[PDB]
Design a protein around this ligand. Structure first.
Ligand code: CLA
Ligand code: CLA
Ligand code: CLA
Ligand code: CLA
Ligand code: CLA
Ligand code: CLA
Ligand code: CLA
Ligand SMILES: CCCCCCCCCCCCCCCCCC(=O)OC[C@H](CO[C@@H]1O[C@H](CO)[C@H](O)[C@H](O)[C@H]1O)OC(=O)CCCCCCCCCCCCCCCCC
Ligand SMILES: CCCCCCCCCCCCCCCC(=O)OC[C@H](COP(=O)(O)OC[C@@H](O)CO)OC(=O)CCCCCCCCCCCCCCC
Ligand SMILES: CC1=C(/C=C/C(C)=C/C=C/C(C)=C/C=C/C=C(C)/C=C/C=C(C)/C=C/C2=C(C)CCCC2(C)C)C(C)(C)CCC1
Ligand SMILES: CC1=C(C/C=C(\C)CCC[C@H](C)CCC[C@H](C)CCCC(C)C)C(=O)c2ccccc2C1=O
Ligand code: SF4
Lengths: 73, 80, 143, 64, 73, 41, 740, 165
């Protein structure tokens, strides 16, 4: 059970990394803003700095506080 | 070899040709700038892609762009 | 320049000791590069692939395995002594090529005698997306 | 004469420029009819290190 | 301790999501390098100019994200 | 005094003064008062 | 010719340049537009070459820099003496060194730190120290805390004097360049004067002060009734009973009857059985002979009175035909380049620190130091690492000299130019011997691991199986053991108990015992030789290829510390000599970590232990001859068999070592961000954060920028080294305190 | 008694942990005379241990199956039951100081930006204006709310550097 869990978890994570990498490959290779102008994709690309900044904020906040209590304990 | 392209944003400080130690870039007369000069790359097959012209480029964004790919015996910088 | 100069086999070479950094088997198989200059006196310079060599009063000859070594030596000479040298390329079959300015007054000048090549009249960033040139063989910057 | 006033604060709308949606000061505007005659100076440097750049007429409007 | 390790897991997922999402959104353009779409998906760098452009590609974002994926799993 | 207090106003000294103030404040709170867990007044 | 050329008041004493932090560099004198201005400010702070091109101002700057460092070290030493005077159990430790652990740091009861005040004995609680200051204060005869207070106050006074001296010798009376270029006077004054005068003063202090105190200390006399050393100094009657040669009273010294001084200037091999350290009479004759050797060597060079040696003549006269011009210009380089002399001095200082660590682990020169396993291990490891750091810095500053101060005009066919000429041959042969040593050391380790894993221990490279006996080292051991018999007949015994036949022990614990060398020691020693050859290959390649290379011919014009020349030629990343030093730091770290692991395991398994009536039992089970031949044996029986006290240190006196261990793990792991990653991703993330701060108008006037590539590499190597050093420090100290 | 956690006053493992800590602390007490200064420090440590165990109990704190007190994080559950002192009131306690630092940093950034060469002000701090803003930041949420409504807190993205995608 332990080997099965760990194997499929690592497989799932590698497949996650591949999914995001191939999404980036979509964004650089074949993406026409003129074809989809003003849609959900173009609007997500419109405020991408907000998304990245909020992800950085929540990651920094979780890491800061979690490491704080782990070191404290 | 590598592809070196110069756009119309160049205004001719004739300093991108000094930073390239491979004689890839040359300066031709032009009329789209005050200095009446424009960078050109006649020996673009002798470029390695060291991007020193990009470091020397003062325009934002850069007038000269070097694109990697299709490497050869001269663009790889081997003396062997 | 006004007339394209051909290097002379007779010209001397600077005195130098044995340096491990130098010509390789690529000089035999592939092409190699040759640098020439005319000296006013005997001065000490540093080779781009070796140590220090005392050069000869008059014509001189250097053989470099790479063009980057030749232009490094050219820039060193021009900076240190206002020397203005020129280098060549010698192929495997004996063909001689002239890469240091064919116009003769260096890439820093213009001379109104060379044609603009690989120049885009559009601004950087105005190039089309790779989807518009997909399955065509032409890059967006190559247009 | 064909561009903005010298010394006036202007806004740059060039997308690929580092100073997109920023405010710069006009230092010189060329009257010879070149590609990018409006030359402006910015208070903050770019990543290269320079602080001045040139733009076309359509890339320069007055900021609100 | 189960709660703390769960929030550490959430931190790992959040940071991996942050880097992968940022690499996907910055895959075609960025303020340091707008023309990333012209250099292909997997290219080394742009050079030492503009302060240094090491690991600027979205492929490099994936490559840095695999370490965080390995740590999270 | 002006020439020295201009140096006194730069960031490394500010990097000490805030640090000394906050550190000493927390030392005195953890010293005079014991180690608590609940803010039940 | 040699004189004192000094310029008076070149720099005004004011805070005008303190007001503007960026003043040494004209590039930083404009303002902090980007956040890299601060890192360039703290980076080019002491780089005096680009501050100005004048060598005289650079020499004054480095002179007062050395003055400031000397004042800082004197402040630190005075603080250590004050800590031993006030918060210590030195009085208790003097009356019982074998049962009371040394302690000189007392923590506050502020937040749970009272558990760190360990029960070290003698009615005292505090941090159990490891520097061995108590052993030094027992060797140099020190009884009460009043004397330590006086030493601390004198050290503070001399530190203030050194800082005032730096201020004077820069701002008030700065020497000229000709004053610093008097190399012959410098060498004579720092050979006869500094080294010789210090050695003679220490020999006199040992003879008149330390010898009677140590003679009364090991005889069972309590230190309270031991007479103060001024009584021994003034009164010949008190010093006459302890040493009968003092009744002669300097008569044998001038009458050439030095054999009468054989009571307190002895020539004895071994250690004092009562204390475990070297005999103080042997150290007295040693420092006296060292003072003689440095007084005679300090009158070699010619300065002002005709006689002597001219270093330029000595260098230019040694010319041999396979070298062309022999040492022709090196006097001109070493009198004009600070970095070349820095490289030479740092290399010799680091190597001599390595010798210091080896020769303290071999012969303990302090009373009750051999039995104090923690002090010996800490001294060996600390001086080991400091020597490695000085050697790596020597390589770095040699590369800096190569980039900056090297010119081809003075050197044409000398040794330096010819080393530049055949650098490819040197690098290729070093690579060959690197691969050869790596294979027939580490492949031997892997093969032993495989044959252990395959159930065939008879095919291993061990003592039971086919063996690689270190015959040369064992023959040297036997020769040194039999050296007092024939080649040094006046020696009482062997110079060290590494190769002896007897075991000394103080307080029931083994002080120093004979060391046996087998196949495992052969494997580890050749592993060390391989690792040092790799590190010297990296440093020497970085030095040699700093000027020019077949890849980048114009590397000289690109400076010493530059990140790259771009992705050209396939990518010239880390091509600078600074990055060569950056990799050599990690290779140094691996080398010295394996070296100190070998030291700790060998000394705990074959030297350190508690003596019994039925034989000698070591700290471990003597498993170094059976487990050091394989990687898994090394792992399980050194890093897992030990470190069981670090994990269970919580709730005890050494829990801070476990906290330090895990924090070191954190910092070592945190460094790999700055090592694996680059700058463009971090710059884009910083751009997104800048947009976030721009949205609600908290945009800093200084533009936030990512760290430079060289800056990122420096941060990564610094955090990595700090984490690894603190990891090994915490593990070693906790293991040697909870057990030894 | 929520989530299967007994109160600390009526927990056997909590008292067993207290007895174990008192035993090891008194173990070191036998190696020193009572009139010594290490004895006084150990006595003060034991008094601090007893005071901490007493104050941690009878305060609504609870623990389960370990003898180590637990904290309740859900609001409402920490309000109906007396557990708001664990994290509910420290939440607003930290946020007040966190908003204090953010507000005084914002006011200093705004004040310095309307000045010639504002990049120097970040490395050359001025004491009287920073200390005046330090003591004029007690009402940070009142200044934050009024700036939020009127656009002085935020900035429209037409003067904000945005990525070129
Ligand atoms: C175990 C080692 C380790 C640790 C602790 C971190 C920690 C971090 N990395 Mg990470 N990383 C690592 C290894 C590690 N990394 C490796 C090996 C890689 C592969 C190259 C990466 C790749 C990577 C990427 C690609 C990214 C990160 C990011 C982050 C941050 C995530 C935010 C967070 O969790 O809150 C903070 C987490 C902490 C652990 C806090 C650390 C600070 C504490 C409070 C100590 C501060 C100093 C202390 C007060 C003492 C002061 C004095 C002292 C300075 C001398 C954080 C700083 C992301 C980031 O920075 O975006 C925001 C990001 O994009 N990392
Ligand atoms: C981010 C996580 C985190 C959190 C929530 C805490 C919170 C706390 N810890 Mg921990 N701690 C942390 C990180 C953290 N610390 C780290 C990183 C370390 C290692 C350096 C420690 C080491 C540590 C120790 C060793 C101890 C604490 C203690 C404390 C308490 C003291 C609070 C205080 O100063 O009085 C309250 C302060 C104020 C009210 C300030 C007043 C300001 C104005 C005037 C209002 C509190 C419960 C102590 C304690 O009480 O034990 C439970 C204690 O013994 N912690
Ligand atoms: C016999 C005379 C003598 C002595 C003893 C020294 C001693 C020293 N010199 Mg040297 N020096 C001398 C003559 C002497 N110098 C001459 C003639 C020149 C000119 C050629 C120099 C030029 C020189 C330079 C350029 C430098 C030194 C430095 C040093 C110090 C090296 C630090 C060290 O190794 O740790 C040993 C440390 C100690 C022993 C600490 C105690 C230091 C005491 C206070 C110094 C007392 C010695 C002094 C000569 C007494 C007379 C000075 C008087 C005006 C008060 C050391 C103290 C370095 C330095 O700056 O440090 C000052 C350095 O970079 N020396
Ligand atoms: C005899 C000793 C000596 C002397 C006089 C010098 C002098 C010099 N070196 Mg050299 N160096 C030395 C030893 C020495 N170094 C050693 C031992 C090493 C190996 C590590 C180096 C490695 C080295 C490199 C790689 C470089 C220099 C450079 C320099 C120059 C400027 C240094 C500077 O401004 O630092 C500024 C001071 C600092 C940045 C502070 C140091 C902070 C470090 C990074 C961290 C220290 C942490 C500490 C150990 C523990 C604290 C923990 C923390 C949590 C608080 C100057 C010529 C540089 C140069 O340009 O040369 C011309 C350069 O590139 N040196
Ligand atoms: C423990 C980690 C580790 C290991 C093993 C290596 C291994 C190597 N590095 Mg590296 N190094 C590392 C980490 C490591 N690196 C890190 C983290 C850094 C960054 C600081 C560097 C920095 C660095 C530099 C700067 C240099 C090296 C060099 C080397 C080589 C030394 C070869 C040698 O003499 O040994 C012998 C070979 C080995 C130990 C490899 C394993 C051999 C095993 C025992 C197998 C034996 C044969 C086997 C049966 C064949 C298998 C057949 C199969 C295919 C069927 C080798 C390729 C140097 C180099 O190029 O060589 C001179 C060099 O200059 N490395
Ligand atoms: C998203 C965060 C979050 C989460 C997961 C919870 C979760 C919970 N809250 Mg809580 N709450 C929150 C935020 C949150 N709260 C906030 C912000 C407030 C305002 C301060 C409250 C105020 C609050 C009160 C006043 C009460 C709860 C209660 C509850 C519990 C029952 C929920 C319910 O509808 O009954 C299950 C219904 C099924 C149909 C549950 C544990 C109740 C409780 O403790 O239960 C006894 C209760 O009385 N909450
Ligand atoms: C007071 C100034 C200030 C303010 C108002 C903000 C506000 C913000 N930052 Mg920023 N930040 C600051 C300084 C500031 N930051 C500094 C100095 C750094 C460098 C260490 C950062 C690094 C930083 C990162 C890396 C990130 C943010 C993010 C954020 C957002 C989340 C809120 C938060 O707590 O972030 C957490 C902030 C920190 C962890 C930085 C703490 C550093 C200290 C507390 C600031 C010291 C400022 C000083 C005391 C002011 C001077 C006072 C004056 C009287 C002289 C928010 C928009 C995040 C974001 O994009 O969210 C959308 C994000 O990812 N910030
Ligand atoms: C008492 C609190 C500190 C002084 C408050 C008054 C004040 O700031 O006056 C302001 C004076 C001088 O005010 C100066 O005026 C100039 C002209 O406007 C510039 O603005 C300077 O930046 C400013 O410092 O500065 C000081 O008193 C500096 C105090 C010391 C530095 C900060 C504290 C450091 C504490 C740790 C180190 C010392 C111990
Ligand atoms: C292992 C490394 C072997 C290096 C062999 C070449 C050394 C370098 C070399 O050729 O040095 C040449 C040197 C003799 O040359 P000269 O006597 O003319 O040089 C002496 C003057 O430099 C003083 O011979 C040796 O050192 C012999 C021992 C070599 C060991
Ligand atoms: C019924 C139920 C429930 C609910 C649930 C839910 C509601 C869920 C959800 C879930 C979800 C909701 C999830 C999600 C996920 C997601 C993800 C995982 C994503 C990913 C992504 C990616 C990977 C991307 C990619 C890309 C890019 C990068 C770019 C562009 C292109 C693309 C798109 C491709 C509950 C709990 C109440 C209870 C129980 C039952
Ligand atoms: C993480 C990272 C960064 C980003 C790191 C940066 C910008 C440096 C950040 C330094 C901080 C701001 C120093 C101060 C740290 C804390 C604010 C201190 C807190 C102290 C408490 C008392 C509050 C790089 O720029 C980089 C560049 C090149 C290679 C690798 C990397 C790299 O790995
Ligand atoms: S060091 Fe960085 S910028 Fe330079 S070639 Fe390598 S990845 Fe590119």
């Amino acid at each position: 059970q332990a080997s099965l869990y760990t194997h499929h978890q690592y497989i799932a994570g590698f497949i996650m990394c591949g999914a995001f990498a191939h999404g980036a490959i979509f964004f650089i290779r074949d993406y026409d803003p003129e074809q989809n102008k003003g849609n959900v994709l173009a609007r997500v690309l419109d405020h991408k700095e907000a998304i990245i900044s909020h992800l950085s904020w929540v990651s920094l906040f979780l890491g800061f506080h979690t490491l704080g209590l782990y070191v404290h304990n | 070899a590598h592809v070196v392209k110069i756009y119309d944003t160049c205004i001719g400080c004739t300093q991108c040709v000094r930073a390239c130690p491979l004689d890839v870039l040359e300066m031709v007369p032009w009329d789209g700038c005050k200095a009446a000069q424009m960078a050109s790359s006649p020996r673009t097959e002798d470029c390695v892609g060291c991007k020193r012209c990009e470091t020397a480029c003062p325009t934002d964004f850069l007038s000269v762009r070097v694109y990697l790919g299709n490497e050869s015996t001269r663009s790889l910088g081997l003396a062997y | 320049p006004w007339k394209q100069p051909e290097l002379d086999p007779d010209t001397p070479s600077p005195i130098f000791g044995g340096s491990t950094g130098g010509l390789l088997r690529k000089a035999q198989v592939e092409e190699f590069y040759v640098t020439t200059w005319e000296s006013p006196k005997e001065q000490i310079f540093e080779m781009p692939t070796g140590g220090a060599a005392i050069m000869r009063k008059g014509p001189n000859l250097l053989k470099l395995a790479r063009k980057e070594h030749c232009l490094a030596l050219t820039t060193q000479l021009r900076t240190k002594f206002r020397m203005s040298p020129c280098f060549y390329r010698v192929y495997a079959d004996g063909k001689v090529e002239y890469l240091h300015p064919k116009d003769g007054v260096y890439p820093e000048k213009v001379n109104a005698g060379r044609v603009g090549v690989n120049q885009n009249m559009r601004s950087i960033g105005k190039n089309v997306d790779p989807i518009k040139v997909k399955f065509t063989g032409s890059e967006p910057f190559e247009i | 004469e064909i561009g903005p006033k010298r010394g006036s604060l202007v806004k740059v709308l060039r997308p690929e420029s580092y100073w997109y949606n920023q405010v710069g000061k006009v230092v010189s505007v060329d009257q010879s009819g070149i590609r990018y005659p409006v030359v402006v100076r910015f208070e903050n440097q770019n990543y290269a290190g320079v602080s001045t750049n040139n733009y076309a007429l359509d890339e320069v409007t007055d900021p609100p | 301790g189960d709660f703390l390790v769960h929030h550490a897991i959430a931190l790992g997922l959040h940071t991996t999501t942050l880097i992968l999402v940022k690499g996907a959104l910055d895959a075609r353009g960025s303020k340091l390098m707008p023309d990333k779409k012209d250099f292909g998906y997997s290219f080394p760098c742009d050079g030492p100019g503009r302060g240094g452009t090491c690991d600027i590609s979205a492929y490099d974002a994936f490559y840095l994200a695999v370490f965080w994926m390995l740590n999270t799993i | 005094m002006k020439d020295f207090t201009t140096y006194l106003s730069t960031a490394p000294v500010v990097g000490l003064g805030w640090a000394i103030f906050t550190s000493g404040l927390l030392i005195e709170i953890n010293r005079f008062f014991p180690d608590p867990l609940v803010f039940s007044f | 010719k040699v004189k004192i050329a000094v310029d008076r008041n070149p720099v005004e004493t004011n805070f005008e340049k303190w007001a503007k932090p960026g003043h040494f560099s004209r590039a930083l004198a404009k303002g902090p537009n980007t956040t890299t201005w601060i890192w360039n400010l703290h980076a080019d702070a002491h780089d005096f070459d680009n501050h100005t091109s004048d060598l005289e101002e650079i020499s004054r700057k480095v002179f007062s820099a050395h003055f400031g460092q000397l004042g800082i070290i004197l402040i630190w030493l005075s603080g250590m003496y004050f800590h031993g005077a006030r918060f210590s159990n030195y009085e208790g430790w003097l009356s019982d060194p074998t049962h009371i652990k040394p302690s000189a740091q007392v923590v506050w009861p502020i937040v749970g730190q009272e558990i760190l005040n360990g029960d070290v004995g003698g009615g005292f609680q505090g941090i159990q120290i490891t520097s061995g200051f108590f052993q030094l204060w027992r060797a140099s005869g020190i009884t009460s805390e009043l004397q330590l207070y006086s030493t601390a106050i004198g050290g503070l006074v001399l530190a203030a004097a050194c800082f005032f001296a730096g201020w004077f010798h820069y701002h008030k009376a700065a020497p000229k360049l000709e004053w610093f270029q008097n190399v012959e006077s410098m060498l004579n004054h720092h050979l006869a004067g500094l080294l010789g005068l210090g050695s003679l003063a220490w020999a006199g202090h040992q003879i008149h002060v330390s010898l009677p105190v140590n003679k009364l200390l090991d005889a069972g006399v309590d230190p309270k009734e031991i007479p103060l050393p001024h009584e021994f100094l003034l009164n010949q009657s008190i010093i006459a009973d302890l040493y009968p040669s003092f009744s002669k009273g300097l008569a044998p010294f001038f009458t050439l009857n030095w054999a009468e001084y054989s009571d307190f200037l002895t020539f004895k091999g071994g250690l004092n059985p009562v204390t475990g350290g070297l005999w103080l009479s042997d150290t007295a004759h040693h420092h006296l002979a060292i003072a003689v050797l440095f007084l005679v060597a300090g009158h070699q060079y010619r300065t002002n009175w005709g006689i002597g040696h001219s270093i330029k003549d000595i260098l230019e006269s040694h010319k041999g035909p396979f070298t062309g011009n022999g040492h022709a210009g090196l006097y001109e380089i070493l009198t004009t380049s600070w970095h070349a002399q820095l490289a030479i001095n740092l290399a010799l200082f680091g190597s001599l620190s390595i010798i210091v660590a080896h020769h303290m682990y071999a012969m303990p020169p302090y009373p009750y130091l051999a039995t104090d396993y923690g002090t010996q291990l800490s001294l060996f490891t600390h001086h080991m690492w400091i020597g490695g750091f000085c050697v790596v810095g020597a390589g770095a500053h040699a590369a800096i000299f190569m980039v900056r101060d090297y010119d081809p005009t003075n050197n044409y066919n000398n040794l330096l130019d010819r080393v530049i000429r055949h650098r490819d041959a040197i690098i290729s042969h070093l690579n060959w011997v690197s691969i050869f040593l790596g294979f027939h050391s580490f492949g031997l380790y892997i093969h032993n691991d495989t044959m252990s894993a395959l159930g065939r221990p008879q095919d291993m490279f061990s003592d039971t199986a086919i063996q690689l006996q270190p015959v040369f080292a064992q023959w040297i051991q036997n020769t040194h053991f039999t050296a007092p018999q024939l080649t040094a007949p006046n020696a009482l015994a062997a110079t060290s108990l590494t190769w002896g036949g007897d075991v000394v022990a103080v307080g029931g614990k083994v002080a120093m015992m004979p060391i046996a060398l087998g196949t495992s020691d052969f494997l580890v020693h050749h592993i060390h030789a391989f690792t040092i050859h790799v590190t010297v290959l990296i440093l020497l390649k970085g030095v040699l290829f700093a000027r020019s290379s077949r890849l980048i011919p114009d590397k000289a014009n690109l400076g010493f510390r530059f990140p790259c020349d771009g992705p050209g030629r396939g990518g010239t990343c880390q091509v600078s000599a600074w990055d060569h030093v950056f990799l050599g730091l990690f290779w140094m770290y691996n080398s010295l970590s394996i070296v100190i692991f070998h030291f700790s395991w060998k000394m705990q398994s074959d030297v350190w232990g508690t003596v019994t009536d039925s034989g000698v039992s070591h700290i471990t089970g003597g498993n170094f001859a059976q487990s050091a031949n394989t990687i898994n044996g090394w792992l399980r029986d050194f890093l897992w068999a030990q470190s069981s006290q670090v994990i269970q240190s919580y709730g005890s006196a050494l829990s801070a070592y476990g906290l330090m261990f895990l924090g070191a793990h954190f910092v070592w792991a945190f460094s790999l961000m700055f090592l694996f990653s680059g700058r463009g991703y971090w710059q884009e993330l910083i751009e997104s954060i800048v947009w976030a701060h721009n949205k609600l108008r908290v945009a800093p006037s200084i533009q936030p920028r990512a760290l430079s590539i060289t800056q990122g590499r420096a941060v990564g190597v610094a955090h990595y080294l700090l984490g690894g050093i603190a990891t090994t420090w915490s593990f070693f100290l906790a293991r040697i305190i909870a057990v030894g | 008694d929520i989530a299967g956690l007994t109160p600390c006053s009526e927990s056997k493992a909590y008292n067993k942990l207290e007895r174990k800590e008192l035993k090891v602390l008194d173990k070191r007490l036998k190696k020193y005379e009572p009139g010594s200064a290490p004895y006084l420090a150990l006595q003060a440590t034991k008094e601090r241990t007893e005071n901490r165990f007493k104050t941690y109990a009878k305060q609504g704190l609870l623990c389960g199956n370990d003898g180590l007190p637990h904290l309740i994080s859900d609001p409402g559950l920490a309000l109906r039951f007396n557990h708001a002192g664990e994290v509910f009131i420290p939440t607003f306690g930290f946020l007040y100081v966190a908003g204090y630092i953010g507000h005084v940093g914002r006011q200093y950034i705004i004040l310095s930006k309307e000045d010639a060469k504002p990049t120097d002000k970040e490395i050359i701090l001025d004491v009287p204006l920073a200390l005046k803003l330090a003591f004029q930041g007690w009402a940070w949420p009142l200044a934050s709310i009024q700036e939020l409504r009127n656009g002085s807190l935020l900035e429209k993205d037409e003067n904000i550097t945005v990525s070129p995608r």
